Structure formats: C-alpha cells, structure tokens
From a paper:
So, for this study, we engineered a construct encoding only the ctATC domain (ctATC-WT; aa 1939–2253) fused to a removable N-terminal His6-maltose binding protein (MBP) tag and then introduced the mutations [name] and [name] (ctATC2Cys). Using these criteria, we selected residue N2045, in helix α3, and residue R2238, in helix α12. Structural determination by molecular replacement showed one protein subunit per asymmetric unit forming a trimer through the crystallographic threefold axis. The structure of ctATC2Cys is highly similar to that reported for ctATC-WT, as indicated by the low root-mean-square-deviation for the superposition of all Cα atoms in the subunit (rmsd = 0.439 Å) or in the protein trimer (rmsd = 0.704 Å). The high-resolution electron density map was unambiguous and allowed for the building of the entire polypeptide chain, except for residues 2026–2032 that appeared flexibly disordered in the ctATC2Cys apo structure. These missing residues correspond to a loop (the CP-loop) that projects from one subunit into the active site of the adjacent subunit and interacts with the substrate. The only important difference in the structures of ctATC2Cys that are free or bound to CP was the presence of the mutated Cys residues and the extra electron density between their side chains that demonstrates the formation of three disulfide bridges between subunits in the trimer. Thus, we conclude that the Cys and formation of the disulfide bridges do not alter the protein folding or oligomerization and do not interfere with the binding of CP. Instead, the double mutant ctATC2Cys had a Tm = 73.5 °C, 20 °C higher than ctATC-WT, and similar to the Tm of human ATC bound to PALA, which induces a tight and nearly irreversible complex. Extrapolation of the curves to an infinite concentration of the chemical indicated that Cys substitutions increase the Tm by 3–4 °C and that the remainder is due to disulfide bridge formation.
Numbering used by the authors:
A (entry chain A), B (entry chain A), C (entry chain A): 1939 to 2028, 2032 to 2253
Write the structure that this text describes.
C-alpha cells in the first residue's frame, strides 16, 4: 500500500523542498497518508526497505539536534544511508562550493543555514534535491508539515477547529508557515500576543482573506482558552523587549501551567515547536494535552514520507 | 546458539542500564556468554543480523571517543543503525527535553553527562532504555562489565586470583564498580595508593565483608607485584595533590615500566581503563601482559551483547 | 566483472595507503578500472554489496569535509559501515593510543593529522590498515589518485598531453604527488608560478629526468594557455608573500576567469584540488571546462575502488 501511494504522482518527487508555498492541499494529503503508513511500517519492521540505495547528507551550519537527528533517523528507517556533516565553529568555503561537493556523494541534502538567501544559492547551484531545514529562520517547511500533521492526528479533523497562537507572533515564523498551510480548511484563529509582537500585516491579512480571524488579544483570557482546540505556543525571548520588566510581565501572563490549563478544554492540544524556555511549565509535561513531544514522533513519519517522495 | 542465549530471560531486556547494582551474577554470566559468541560471529560475518530494525542514539555531553565509538561500532556490527549526536561546545535545552526528543527517533540512548543525577533525569522522563556511559564519573557500568570480562578472558578464571589496584583509588570509581562486581568470587585484593587517595571506607568495608582485603600499601613493592595476577592501574592527576613535588613523587613510584614489570609474574595482566598519562610507560605496550588495548576489543563484544539483550 | 577485478592481485590489499611511492603503474591501472565499474554499479544500485561486513573509521584531527565525507560515502556505497570520529577542538590522548583504540572497532581507519610523522606513528602502532587523508599536507595520496583519474577520464588518454600547473608550486604538494604519478606517461609540463613559489629542485629534477619539463614561467601567457590540455590550479595564500602588493599582483595575474579562458583550448580541463579562494572565478563554474566539481565525483569512485581493494 505504501508502494502504491509512493508510485502516485507528487510535486515532491525529485524536487527541492524550500517553501510551503510550493505545495498544494493534494500534495500534503498524500504526504500525510504516506506518513501514516510509515508509522505502521516502523512499528512492524523498525527499518524499512524503501530507500535502500539512497544517501542523504545533512548539512547544518547551526546545530538543531531535533531537526538533524529527525532527518537522520527518518532516512535510516527508510533503509537509506546518512552522512551527517560535522557543524564547524568557523570564514570557510562558500555554501555553493560545499553543496556541489556534497552533491557528488549524496542523492539529497538537508540544509540549515543562518542566511535566508541560502535557499536561492541552493536553487542556482545544487544539482541534487535540497530540503530546507531552516533558512535564517524565515521558513522551516517540514516543521510546518509536522505541525499540521500533529493537529490532524491529535484532533482527527481540521474543520470546526479553533487554533490559538500565543507568544511572539512577529518573529515566530512557524506560525506564519502554519497560517499559510491552514488556508484550505474551515478553522478559526485567535492571536494572543503583545501588541509589539503581533503578526505581520500580510499574515494577518491572510487570515482575514480566509474568513478565519476570530480574535486578537494581549491577554490569554479564560474565555480565549475555553474555546481553544489547539494552543500553539511560541518562545518569547528577552531581546524582543527593551526592558526586563515588560519581558517578565508578558512571560508570566503567557506561561502555560496548571493555573492556565484549568481554563482549557479537556481536549485542547498544547503544541510548541521547541526549544522552550519557561513558557510551558515542566509540571504539565505528563498531561494528556501536552503534545510537544508527540510532535517530534509525528515529525519522524512526516519526514520519512517526505524523503520517500523526494528520492524515490 | 546466540539466538538461544538471547531468547533466555534477562534483567537487561527493555531495561535502563544505569548502575552495576541492578544486575546479578547470573545476569553477567549470560552477558559474558553472549559476548563470547558475538566475537565468534564478528570474526565470521563482520556485521551480524541481530538488531537490523533497531536504532541507537549516542548522546555524549562530554567527549569520550573510546566509549562512544565502541557503542556505535557494537550497534552497527549487530546490524542496527546509529545516530551519534554531535557534542556541542555549549546554556542549552534541558537534558529531559533532549532525551524525550531523541526517544521519538531511536529505540535506546547511550548517555554520558557531567551531572551524576543525569541517571535520575533519564529514569523519570525517558520512555526508551538509557545506557549510562558515564554520570559525572560516578558510575560507568559497561566499563565495569568489560573490565571483569577482560579478567575472565585473560586469566581463564576468577577463583584464586589476586588483584592489585594501583593509583588514585579515591577518585578512580571504575575500581569501586569492579570491587562491587567482584563480590561473588574468591579473590584477594591489594590496594596500592597514597594515603590521601585510598578507597572510601564503604568500598574498603565491602572488601572486608567479602573476606577479600589482602594488603594496603603506599608503595608498589616487589612483594606486592610478585603475587599480582591483575595489575589494574588508574590515572593519578595533579589536582589530587596540593604540591607538585608530592604529585611527581607518587607518579614515579607507581609508573609501570620494565623496571616494575620485572617483579611481576610472567602472567600478570596489566589493565588500565584509559585515558592514561604516563602511569603506564609506552615501552611496555608491546609486552604480552599489556592488556589495556585488548580491553577495548573485549568491550566491543561486551557492548554488543548488552545492546542485543536490551533491545532484542 | 568488478568481482573478477577485485579478486585480481593488488598491492592495496590489506595495506596501509600512506604515500604514492608505494604503488606501481599496474596498481593504479587496476584501481582506475575498478573505479570505472564502481561508477556503473552506483548508477544501477546506489548502494552495492562489496564490503557489507566491514567497518571504516574516519579520524580527522583537522576538518576536511570534502575528504571525510567522500570516504564516508564511498564506504557506505560499498555497503560497508562508517564510524566518523568527531573532530575535537582540543592536549588530548596520543595519536597511537587513539588508533589502537579505534582499531578494536573498525577494519580500517582514514587518518588526517597536522603532523607529517603521523604516518610513521600509524605504521609502528596501528594493527589495521590506515589510509592517509593528509599528513601535515605533505602527502594526500587519494587526492593524487583522483587527480590522475580525472585527467584520464576527461581527456581519454595520458599520452601527448600538456599539463600546466599554476599558482604556489612550492607549498602545493598535490602538484608534487601528481608529478610523481605522471612519471610513466609521455606528457609535457608547464610550470607557471612566482619565482619564490617554484617547484622544489628535487621535484623539478623529477620532470627533467622524465623528459617532461616544457617551460617555466612567472606569467600565465596566452602562449602557455594555448597549448594547455590540463590547467591544474593551486591556492595562492597571502602568507606566501611578505607584502600585500605582491600577493594581490600574483593573484590578479593567475586568476582563471573568462579573460584568461579565451586563450585556452576548447578542450582544456580546469582542475583545482579545493578549497579555492578567488584564483578560479565563480563566473567559469558553469563552463564545460570547469572540472573541479567533477573531480569530487571522480574521487568517490576512486575511493570506493581503493576501499574495496584494501578491505576485501
């Protein structure tokens, strides 16, 4: 059955994966279908036989253990091989020289780089598929895929859901990517954020265009929480505020702990792309609704399906 | 035959491997039996087919090439897959967040961490087996296993042996772990150490309880050496002494070179957990009795058998 | 057919690969033959089944992504396993201790080390084959092999060729190694270099002995370029010159860009061992004659064949 799905046509095949804007609702539906079978296969066989003759390089100019190890494990559980490039402390060879070098060894490269334009360098020069693992934190498409997959799997549907984004919605680009992916579905969105860290006007206008913008609030109210199906939290960082007083104030209001979960639904899904500071208290980690570690498991099967589609 | 042994019941199966205190004489006998077959299998096939669908993460917060590469090679020679997590220079994500992340990718994690309590964090939070590769140097259970295996294999038995521990017996915790493992057998122990760096009273009292304590000496005498079956050396570090004069004095007395081996038995086994400074001179490396590199080979088969038992 | 070639006798089998001076014209002919089949196999199967039960360690004391990842990918595309040792920032264990440790885990080690004498340490102490990935930049034998292979493959022959070495021919040791490998063939050599950075007298005298030295020039003339079949460029580094003025002067004269390629042949092969600074302009990267990335692909198949011969 996975064989049939992977034989089906896809925009992923032999393609760079650089932006969520490349892919359709149909593309993601197939990805999630294959992801579902990837999980069943792994439960049965552990290491599958899909990409046995393929080699993936991972090329992370800044470390992200959660992302790089996810791709390594996905590739190896597809039966493929991985070559993780040591992240140097360096000044060094140009990105395009390194990519063209590694393209002689591997069939695809996962690239994470602090320059947003790194995706344009990859497009111009790299003769094998490049998967964007983070381009100056502008986009992180497989994080967007796994976030959406997490919602679908935790709550079973997409229609009728209310999603509450809380924290730094200006710098929290995973929110923007997920807002783009949500344009097809009949959802409602609540934006809880300091006034300084609200969504960029273009992303807000995306929600307006879709008839999805429900409420905008500085405060994480019992009322907002009471109607939340998905509480998607972002990291609030001190550099976003000139004064410490304001920074700690906003943190204390937004901290997700038992004091705030008591206003949520029994079925609210608490999500966080991670790393976290203290915006989600450790005391809630064992709560049913704490889904930010299931998120990582969902990402494995999503990236297995992505790698299968790209390199098969 | 390995298949039969691995089908046999074991305390290792699906278990954390955190302390030598978890396991019995029977547990270790089975481990060593399987280790013996692991060596035969490797000699015949190089890479076996025991853990083909399993994935091991190695998570070393401080480097130990001898330990991490041993586990990587053992896992891969079992036919499994390995994901070695780059040791960062970092301040970073909490240990429990990282473990729960990597548990979504792998079936077991080998963890080395500078906090002794890291084993308690792993117990509370990690939903897959964690193997302790060193917890603030308090314990290193697979080092204890391979040390004991080395003795069994080099000398053929455990009964009637005299073991001489030399060096820093206060901070040299591999000695303490091995003393615990030796409680079942009819051995005699000689402790050669500066008075400041003698065994902790509890560990000494362990030897007394077992009727194994033979002699305690500041000097590495021709008499002590003449009755030594196993000379287990530890690193003496300058920080253990306020003055340089005392540090160099103790080093010169304890240095194992041809000048000191001439008093040993033709069959004395010279062991060292490594890394070494100068307490074992390079001139003895090619001597039959120099077993600290065979130790590493023995560790490979011991860790192959451990990984097989835990994850099969 | 690869099976027959690999069954054929070879100086590579079970041997250290430390210097180009170890191997004959016959040895290299077989290597290149096998390399050719390695490429066909990879095109068909991606990952072959030649070294399925073998384990390669890569041990790089200074990073060289192009070299270490090439060996990793070659080993894995032979169906073998790889254990890449993290390059530390460290003061640490002696080289011989580390090698003897890793020899207990792997069947061969690729070693790159800043001490030229590291090859002598490996010879004395390491009980498995060591492949020299760079010994204080004195030798880099597999780079020499792939350079020669690149010429053979790009131009089809070795007889009648004119090779032009340009840049730092004093510190550019890949030139010296390639000059040694070229002693069998009827080639002519042009040496374009500043007078301070000319070839060492012994290497020049090698070319004289072989009846291959054609011309020595400070300037990269239209005449020299017009007769060049292979333009092998080396990096010119500022430390080679006391004054910046001279350094930039020599760089501007030697920079390979369209302004200089217009004097070359339509068939001139532009080679560079890499990394490059600006001595080969990015504008020529898409030119047919720009072979420094095909070089890397050729290196993969060369190292596949080398690893097959050593460890089969």
């Amino acid at each position: 059955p996975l064989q049939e799905m992977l034989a089906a046509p896809s925009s992923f095949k032999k393609s760079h994966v650089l932006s969520v804007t490349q892919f359709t609702r149909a593309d993601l539906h197939l990805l999630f279908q294959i992801a579902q079978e990837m999980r069943l296969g792994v439960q049965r066989e552990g290491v599958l036989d899909i990409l046995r003759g393929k080699v993936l390089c991972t090329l992370f100019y800044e470390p992200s253990t959660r992302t790089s190890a996810s791709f390594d494990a996905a590739m190896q559980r597809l039966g493929g091989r991985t070559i993780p490039i040591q992240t140097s402390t360096s000044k060094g060879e140009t990105l395009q020289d390194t990519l063209r070098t590694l393209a002689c060894y591997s069939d695809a490269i996962v690239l994470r780089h602090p320059d947003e334009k790194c995706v344009d360098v990859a497009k111009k020069y790299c003769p094998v598929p490049v998967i964007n693992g983070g381009n100056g934190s502008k986009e992180h498409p497989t994080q967007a895929f796994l976030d959406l997959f997490t919602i679908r799997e935790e709550l079973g549907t997409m229609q009728g859901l209310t999603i509450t984004f809380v924290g730094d919605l200006l710098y929290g680009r995973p929110v923007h990517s997920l807002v783009y992916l949500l344009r097809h579905y009949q959802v409602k969105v609540q934006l809880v954020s300091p006034k300084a860290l609200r969504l960029p006007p273009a992303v807000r206008q995306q929600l307006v265009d879709a008839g999805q913008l429900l409420c905008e609030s500085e405060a994480l109210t019992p009322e907002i929480l009471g109607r939340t199906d998905v509480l998607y939290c972002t990291r609030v960082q001190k550099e976003r505020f000139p004064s410490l007083a304001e920074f700690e104030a906003v943190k204390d209001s937004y901290r997700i702990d038992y004091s705030t979960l008591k206003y949520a639904k029994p079925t609210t899904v608490v999500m966080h792309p991670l790393p976290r500071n203290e915006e989600v208290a450790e005391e809630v980690d064992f709560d049913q609704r704490a889904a930010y570690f299931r998120q990582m498991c969902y990402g494995l099967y999503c990236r297995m399906a992505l790698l299968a589609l790209v390199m098969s």
